[PDB]
Amino acid sequence: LDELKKEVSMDDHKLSLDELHNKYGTDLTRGLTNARAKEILARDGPNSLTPPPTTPEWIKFCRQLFGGFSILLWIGAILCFLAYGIQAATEDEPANDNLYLGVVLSTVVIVTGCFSYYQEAKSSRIMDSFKNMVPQQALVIRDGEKSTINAEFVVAGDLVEVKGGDRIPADLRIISAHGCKVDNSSLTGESEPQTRSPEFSSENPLETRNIAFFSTNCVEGTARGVVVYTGDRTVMGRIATLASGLEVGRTPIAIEIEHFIHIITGVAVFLGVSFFILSLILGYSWLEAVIFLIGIIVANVPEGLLATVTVCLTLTAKRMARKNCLVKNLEAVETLGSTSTICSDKTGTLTQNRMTVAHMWFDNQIHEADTTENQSGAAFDKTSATWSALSRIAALCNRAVFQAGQDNVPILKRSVAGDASESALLKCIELCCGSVQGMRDRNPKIVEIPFNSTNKYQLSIHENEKSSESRYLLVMKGAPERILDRCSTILLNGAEEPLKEDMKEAFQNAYLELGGLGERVLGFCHFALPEDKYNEGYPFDADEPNFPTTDLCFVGLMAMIDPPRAAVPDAVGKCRSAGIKVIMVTGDHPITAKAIAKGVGIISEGNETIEDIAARLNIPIGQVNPRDAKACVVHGSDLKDLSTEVLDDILHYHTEIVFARTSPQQKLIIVEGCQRQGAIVAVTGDGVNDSPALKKADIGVAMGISGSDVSKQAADMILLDDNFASIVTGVEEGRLIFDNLKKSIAYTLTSNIPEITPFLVFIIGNVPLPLGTVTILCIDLGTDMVPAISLAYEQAESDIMKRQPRNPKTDKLVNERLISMAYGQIGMIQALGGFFSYFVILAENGFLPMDLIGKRVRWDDRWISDVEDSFGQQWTYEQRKIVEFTCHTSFFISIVVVQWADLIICKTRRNSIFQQGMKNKILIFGLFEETALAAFLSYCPGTDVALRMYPLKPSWWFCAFPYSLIIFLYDEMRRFIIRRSPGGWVEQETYY
Amino acid sequence: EGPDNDERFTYDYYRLRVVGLIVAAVLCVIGIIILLAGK
Amino acid sequence: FLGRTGSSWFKIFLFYLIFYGCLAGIFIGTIQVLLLTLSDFEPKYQDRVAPPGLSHAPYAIKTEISFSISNPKSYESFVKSMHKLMDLYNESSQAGNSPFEDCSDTPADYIKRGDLDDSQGQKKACRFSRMWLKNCGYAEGKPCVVAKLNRIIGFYPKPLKNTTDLPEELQANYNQYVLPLRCAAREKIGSIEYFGLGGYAGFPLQYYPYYGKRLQKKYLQPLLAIQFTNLTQNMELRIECKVYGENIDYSEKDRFRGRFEVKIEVKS
Ligand SMILES: *[C@@H]1O[C@H](CO)[C@@H](O[C@@H]2O[C@H](CO)[C@@H](O)[C@H](O)[C@H]2NC(C)=O)[C@H](O)[C@H]1NC(C)=O
Ligand SMILES: CC(C)CCC[C@@H](C)[C@H]1CC[C@H]2[C@@H]3CC=C4C[C@@H](O)CC[C@]4(C)[C@H]3CC[C@]12C
Ligand SMILES: *[C@@H]1O[C@H](CO)[C@@H](O)[C@H](O)[C@H]1NC(C)=O
Ligand SMILES: [K+]
Ligand SMILES: [K+]
Ligand SMILES: [Mg+2]
Ligand SMILES: [Rb+]
């Protein structure tokens, strides 16, 4: 469906103005007829974007109500009402058991539904942001007259007019223009104004001057044009549809959840029906056969687990909110940890998005300035008298000014009225020479010639601030070579000197080096005009050369670039040390893209492209073995004629990849290419041209300050302070939460065994029921909750940023090793500790373990109010039941006591508690509150009715203590083996 | 005692409940203290 | 195979065999020590049987015994359980001076055979003749229910003293030696008739305290036969038999805590 939109567009900028009118039945001068425009409206439809059909929240909520655990809990809830129905008909049961348990279980499903619904959130308003880029109104020429109309009423063929400050209402063929410049950052991510004129200037319509696009704005001048595309058919309207239309897809974390749901659901249905038939064979009435099944359901399903996961995710997202990293989708909290490839935009993401002075060439020496936002570098020069001469030209031969009321904000961050290069120079001098306004007050400008297309230079004449002179100084800047052809002397370390071929060659060298760094280079020179030839009232003519512009003194060079953000180089290296592949994907030109790649460490030192090898060896590129080149730089124009299989080979064959001059669909294609190889991919960006890629990414991260509204709609995560170091933190947090989820899951599952085994022995042994159904829910929904959550606050056991990204095909959240430990080893020890306390309670009340076998028949018989114990005493029905429920209560408390040790062992997968310590305060809180809850549930009056919880005698609490301790020792010995031999036996069997 | 051994079939479940609830409360307070060591 | 290789499948079996073996051996060990802390003659706790339960022979479907007099197999169900109990109180079961003793044919005081020790043989229990149960196949019309006080080791059932007012106000009040049992329903549409030891409507205190199964096997607890020769027919009658005493109490939950709940209906 969207495969059409993933392709490069076709256009009609090649046609003549006249020819273009024939195609759209239009007038170049009079414009369309009121009737013809209305006709075309009904024909083509409105100049608007329609949002894609969404899934209502209704269906979204209910889709969770049927996912494995909820299905089993539904079967339980209904099976409760089943047994209740069968009762209400047969023998009038005045009880509330099956009825209430059926109500409780149905509530558990609904509430669990809210948790998973909260986790599976999708806040997407892509198409809405795009719609915000179409103006409310447009100016059209109809019947030879200009009028403002609803922009939706704009059709292909009419004559539209735009001027500085307004949004392009539709894709236009420029037919007339006067000084028109446009901001195409929507399509390129670059905000430098692009001229628009009627002349065709490139085969590529996205590069030609005679096309203006919807989603962009006119920055200055005026233009008229013929509408060629409207609504969804515009270049960026298609990007809108592509972006808004892209299928979301399941996250890595989501896939893991479903996976263990299958496992646990599997064992649940297995043991469920495996013992349902095992009971009927033993001659159990279907009346009972279902009651046992309900218990089996409740025992096997970890009722509180899915909600635990959600809370652990939420708590991890809260910590990241506190580092200026907003998470829109709870699952995106983990994806960053599983990320193996980052596709990053350059401008406004890796870079500050601001022309900044990078180097200066004066005194036959290359000086480097500090490009960082917060200025974390050092000085270059202050002493040289040459510097002050260059500094003066940079301030004086400059027409840029700071906007009013910025004195509060830092120099480099403040808004400037002017072109990017003049702003850069302004901020450079203001920083290291103080107030520039001061320099422009001490040296009043009397005449100037602003930068001309033809002159290729800008000159200014000022009254020298010096009192002993107060004469006229000439300054000029422009193209380095043009400035050179106008110089005779060079200000070396203070004093001038003739411009010999020697210094002239050093100039060329300096010029070539700076240009090689992808930096824009300017020349600077001045000339102190002779006093006798220029009186204090001498008039200077700016129109006609009234003053010399030759034999001037060359002062120096200055170079500039849109520099990396301070934290970016280090963040890139850190991603790469964690084994994450970092690719650059930018709408910017290749020379600039490549230079920043080396600056931030995308391309490491020494690595070459095929073009680099060819130039170094002075040989044809076809003569170069492409396998000798680990780095590559792909232009979008070449990308366009490559198949995906060939794109896949590029991705496979290079470690250091730069995709430059890419369109928005091309970014999507590169992302998909990476994913196709089985990689989890993150995208980082800030422009509307990142929207499709951000949507398709497993996780999209947008910049918060510099980011466009669209990009932040398309993302899963926002960096609110533009701190790229947050990606590094995000991946670290993502890995940590993945491990801690394992700990929390194992902990929760472990207590399933002591809830399952009592029901089994109840059938096979014919003893009184050791633990009840209600009692199970008091564990999974009550006591285990805070402890399970607390594992989310566990510190790393080792340097997680030192390991490679997990293999999502092999490294699962829940594997066989977890089940073996939780179900086969620790849970089994917990089961016994439960049974022990059960036998203790009964034996101390007169029913010794031996006489318990095959007694349930008489025990449950409501009409036998005289059962004989081991000592020959006789018990009524309600009397023995009180002891039985007291058994449920102590078995319950036994679970809590054995979960103490389990909580401590689940703390660490490898390390010892004596190494990791007990610095998790939430965990300790869990221990205290868990025990408080259990005690309250046993001793609070009335709980014997609502939950069948009975007061325990002090000695009862200590039954499971020896089992709780064996767990601690056992797991500590086991992990001691793991560490002592990384070999594999204990490791490959039990290492979560 | 002999025929007056009524105490043999008696248990102070009332005190046990009072003590049990005291303990539960104090464990609840202790937990808050440790948690609130930083929020 | 599914998971691993044969070599791995073996090792995982050798482990869980030794592992579960140890766990079973430990579990058993903790059961040993538990038993080692317990007496053979007396349970550690008795507060959960404390107030004695009162149970009867007619096995009630739901605290109810409804049947038809004009039908044979209508009551043959209740006669099965009635027989089961009384069959134990046979004279052939109580033979010789061992381990039985002839005790007062009239309600007497308690009998202490020492302590709960094995320092003596089987503590000798009082004989009880089912022949003390006058009038009661059993009552084919108007049932002859048999009551019973639940056995508790070292329990001395103490009758109420005639200090103040009483339900069966002072009638045949053998204050010193009888634990009374008065059945009731207002709703007085019946005819209560009690049979027992010495002809009294109670339990003779000479059968106490019970020394337990280990120290007193073949021991016999006193019975109290109750006959309802009601002149009514074809209606559910809620009859409650209540025992009175210093050590006797009741509960709204446990409807068998020192009392009966019988729903007789001679639907004939
Ligand atoms: C306990 O006493 C009952 C009294 O009914 C015995 O029942 C006797 O059963 C036999 C054989 O079935 C009959 O011939 C008699 O008529 C019954 N009564 C009597 C008085 O002998 C019963 O057998 C006795 N049980 C034991 C174990 O001795
Ligand atoms: C109540 C009692 C009788 C039930 C005992 C169940 C035992 C036999 C179960 C419980 C957990 C189980 C193990 C759980 C995990 C694994 C790892 C997997 O890669 C192979 C099977 C294996 C090794 C299972 C084998 C059987 C097992 C040990
Ligand atoms: C009980 O049986 C005796 C004979 O043993 C008889 O005289 C008497 O009438 C019976 N009593 C009743 C109330 O039927
Ligand atoms: K995404
Ligand atoms: K559990
Ligand atoms: Mg950008
Ligand atoms: Rb469970």
Q: Which domains does chain C have, with CATH numbers?
A: 1-38 (1.20.5.170), 39-268 (2.60.40.1660)
Q: Is B29 at the interface with chain C, CB within 8 A?
A: no
**First-residue to last-residue Cα distance in chain B:** 57
Task: Verify whether the Cβ–Cβ distance A935 to B38 is below 8 Å.
Answer: no
Contact (CB, 8 A) for C147 and C85: no
A915 burial level (CB within 10 Å; 0-12, 13-18, 19+): exposed
Q: Which long-range contacts (CB under 8 A, 24 or more apart) does A209-213 make?
A: A209/A174, A210/A13, A210/A173, A210/A174, A211/A11, A211/A13, A211/A171, A211/A172, A211/A173, A211/A174, A212/A162, A212/A168, A212/A171, A212/A172, A212/A174, A212/A182, A213/A168, A213/A171, A213/A172, A213/A184, A213/A186, A213/A187
The helix (run of H) or strand (run of E) holding residue C242 is strand C237-243
- Write the CB contacts of A933 (distance below 8 Å, at least 6 apart in sequence): A782, A783, B24
- Write the CB contacts of A932 (distance below 8 Å, at least 6 apart in sequence): B24, B25, B27, B28, B31
Q: Which amino acid, residue A805?
A: P
Residue of B nearest to A941 (CA): B17
Nearest to A964 by CA among A832, A841, A843, A838: A832
Residues C165, C166, C168, C172: is their CA dihedral positive or negative? negative
Helix (H, G, I), strand (E, B) or coil at A873: coil
Judging contacts by C-beta atoms under 8 Å, the chain C residues touching residue A829 are: 23
Contact (CB, 8 A) for A401 and A416: yes
Nearest chain A Cα distance for residue C168, angstroms:
26
Helix (H, G, I), strand (E, B) or coil at A317: helix
Say yes or no: CB of residue C131 within 6 Å of ligand 1: no
A525-544 core/surface letters (b: 16 or more CB in 10 A; e: else): bbbebeeeebeeeeebeeee
Strand C237-243 relative to strand C178-184: parallel, antiparallel, unpaired? antiparallel
**CA A816/CA A988 separation, integer angstroms:** 10
* Whether residue C99 has a cis bond before it, omega within 30° of 0: yes
What order do you get walking across the sheet with A681-685 strand by strand? Answer: A325-327, A717-719, A699-703, A681-685, A341-344, A581-585, A656-660, A631-635
Helix (H, G, I), strand (E, B) or coil at C183: strand
Q: Is B12 at the interface with chain C, CB within 8 A?
A: no
**CA A689/CA A698 separation, integer angstroms:** 18
Residues A251, A257, A260, A265: is their CA dihedral positive or negative? negative
**How far is residue A464 CA from its own chain's centroid?**
55
Chain A residues with a Cβ under 8 Å from any Cβ in chain C: 91, 816, 824-825, 828-829, 832, 835-836, 839-840, 843-846, 848-849, 862-863, 865-866, 868-879, 882-883, 886, 953, 962, 966, 985, 989
CB neighbours of residue A7 within 10 Å:
13
Q: Which amino acid, residue C267?
A: K
Helix (H, G, I), strand (E, B) or coil at B28: helix
**How far is residue A568 CA from its own chain's centroid?**
16
Residue A684's beta-bridge partner residues? A344, A701
In angstroms, what is the resolution?
Answer: 2.9
Residue closest by Cα to atom 6 of ligand 3: C135
Judging contacts by C-beta atoms under 8 Å, the chain B residues touching residue A939 are: 16-17, 20-21, 24
Task: Verify whether the Cβ–Cβ distance B21 to A936 is below 8 Å.
Answer: yes
Task: Verify whether the Cβ–Cβ distance B35 to A921 is below 8 Å.
Answer: yes
Instruction: Give me Rg for the CA atoms of chain A.
Output: 38
Dig out the tokens for A777 from the structure.
Answer: 């829910």
A843 burial level (CB within 10 Å; 0-12, 13-18, 19+): buried
> What's the half-sphere exposure (Cβ side, CA atoms, 13 Å) at A412?
20
Dig out the tokens for A694 from the structure.
Answer: 């951000």
Q: Rounded to whole angstroms, what are the CA distances from A638 to A239, A588, A656, A660, C44? A: 21, 15, 18, 10, 90
**CA A301/CA A109 separation, integer angstroms:** 12
Task: Verify whether the Cβ–Cβ distance C255 to A91 is below 8 Å.
Answer: no
| Chains touching B, CB cut-off 8 Å, 3+ pairs | A, C
Nearest to A845 by CA among C264, C50, C141: C50
**CA A687/CA A709 separation, integer angstroms:** 8
Residue closest by Cα to atom 19 of ligand 1: C90
Q: Which amino acid, residue A177?
A: A
- Mutational pocket test of ligand 2: of A274, A275, A819, A830, the residue with most ligand atoms within 8 Å of the beta carbon: A819
Task: Verify whether the Cβ–Cβ distance A865 to C256 is below 8 Å.
Answer: yes
**CA C217/CA C41 separation, integer angstroms:** 12
Residue of C nearest to B4 (CA): C156
Q: Is C25 at the interface with chain A, CB within 8 A?
A: no
**CA C57/CA C139 separation, integer angstroms:** 13
Strand A699-703 relative to strand A416-417: parallel, antiparallel, unpaired? unpaired
Contact (CB, 8 A) for C222 and C197: yes
Task: Verify whether the Cβ–Cβ distance A932 to B27 is below 8 Å.
Answer: yes
Judging contacts by C-beta atoms under 8 Å, the chain B residues touching residue A922 are: 35
Residues C168, C172, C176, C182: is their CA dihedral positive or negative? negative
Q: DSSP letters of A134-145? A: S-SEEEEEETTE
Closest ligand 3 atom, residue C227 Cα = 13
Task: Verify whether the Cβ–Cβ distance C247 to B2 is below 8 Å.
Answer: no
A8 burial level (CB within 10 Å; 0-12, 13-18, 19+): middle
Active site residues of A: 345
Contact (CB, 8 A) for A554 and A389: no
The helix (run of H) or strand (run of E) holding residue A449 is strand A445-449
Residue A292's beta-bridge partner residues? none
* Ligand nearest, relative to CA of residue C89: 1
Task: Verify whether the Cβ–Cβ distance B3 to C110 is below 8 Å.
Answer: yes
Say yes or no: CB of residue C229 within 6 Å of ligand 3: yes
Q: Which long-range contacts (CB under 8 A, 24 or more apart) does C166-175 make?
A: C166/C244, C167/C244, C172/C200, C172/C201, C174/C107, C174/C200, C174/C202
Q: What share of chain A is helix, strand, coil (3-state, %, to 5)?
A: 50, 15, 35
Unique residue bearing structure tokens 């809210």: A114
Q: Which of B3, B10, B11 sits opposite C156 (nearest CB)?
A: B3
Q: Is C31 at the interface with chain B, CB within 8 A?
A: no
Residues A719, A724, A727, A728: is their CA dihedral positive or negative? negative
Q: Rounded to whole angstroms, what are the CA distances from A908 to A508, A732, A825, A858? A: 63, 17, 16, 47
Q: Rounded to whole angstroms, what are the CA distances from A118 to A68, A115, A491, A745? A: 18, 5, 69, 19
Say yes or no: CB of residue C120 within 6 Å of ligand 1: no
Strand A341-344 relative to strand A681-685: parallel, antiparallel, unpaired? parallel
- Mutational pocket test of ligand 2: of C16, C19, C27, the residue with most ligand atoms within 8 Å of the beta carbon: C16
Q: Which amino acid, residue C173?
A: N
Dig out the tokens for A931 from the structure.
Answer: 């025990």
**CA A306/CA A64 separation, integer angstroms:** 11
Q: Is A690 annotated as a binding residue?
A: yes
**CA A495/CA A602 separation, integer angstroms:** 43
C166 burial level (CB within 10 Å; 0-12, 13-18, 19+): middle
**CA A675/CA A698 separation, integer angstroms:** 9
Task: Verify whether the Cβ–Cβ distance A928 to B13 is below 8 Å.
Answer: no
* Whether residue A768 has a cis bond before it, omega within 30° of 0: no
- Method of determination used here: X-ray
**CA A541/CA A530 separation, integer angstroms:** 17
Residue of C nearest to B13 (CA): C47
Q: Is B38 at the interface with chain A, CB within 8 A?
A: yes
DSSP conformation class of A152: G
Q: Which of C11, C48, C55 sits opposite A883 (nearest CB)?
A: C48
**CA A766/CA A781 separation, integer angstroms:** 29
Judging contacts by C-beta atoms under 8 Å, the chain B residues touching residue A956 are: none
Residue A171's beta-bridge partner residues? A229
Nearest to A813 by CA among A263, A165, A203: A263
How many whole angstroms from C135 Cα to the centroid of ligand 3? 6
Dig out the tokens for A239 from the structure.
Answer: 């990007």
**CA A276/CA C191 separation, integer angstroms:** 51
> What's the half-sphere exposure (Cβ side, CA atoms, 13 Å) at A749?
29
Q: Is A588 annotated as a binding residue?
A: no
- Write the CB contacts of A864 (distance below 8 Å, at least 6 apart in sequence): A858, A877
Nearest to C195 by CA among C172, C222, C167, C227: C227
> What's the half-sphere exposure (Cβ side, CA atoms, 13 Å) at A832?
24
Q: Which domains does chain A have, with CATH numbers?
A: 1-46+126-245 (2.70.150.10), 63-116+246-339+725-992 (1.20.1110.10), 340-352+564-724 (3.40.50.1000), 353-563 (3.40.1110.10)
Dig out the tokens for C220 from the structure.
Answer: 């016999």
Judging contacts by C-beta atoms under 8 Å, the chain B residues touching residue A931 are: 24, 27
Q: Which of A922, A924, A951 sits opposite B20 (nearest CB)?
A: A951
Closest ligand 1 atom, residue C93 Cα = 28
Helix (H, G, I), strand (E, B) or coil at C115: coil
Dig out the tokens for A197 from the structure.
Answer: 């004129």
Closest ligand 2 atom, residue C16 Cα = 28
**CA A893/CA A775 separation, integer angstroms:** 10
Dig out the tokens for A458 from the structure.
Answer: 């800008």
Dig out the tokens for A231 from the structure.
Answer: 């609504």
> Ligand 2 — pocket residues by CB below 6 A?
A 757, 760, 816, 819-820, 823-824; C 3, 12, 16
Instruction: Show me where the domains of chain B are located.
Output: 9-35
Q: Is A244 annotated as a binding residue?
A: no
Residue A589's beta-bridge partner residues? none
DSSP conformation class of C210: B
Residue C263's beta-bridge partner residues? C64, C238
Q: DSSP letters of A580-649? A: -EEEEE-SS-HHHHHHHHHHHTSS-TT---HHHHHHHTT--GGGS-GGG--EEEEEHHHHTT--HHHHHH
Judging contacts by C-beta atoms under 8 Å, the chain B residues touching residue C155 are: 9
Judging contacts by C-beta atoms under 8 Å, the chain A residues touching residue B23 are: 935
DSSP conformation class of A813: S
Alpha helices in chain C, H assignment, sequence order: 6-36, 76-86
**CA C204/CA C104 separation, integer angstroms:** 9
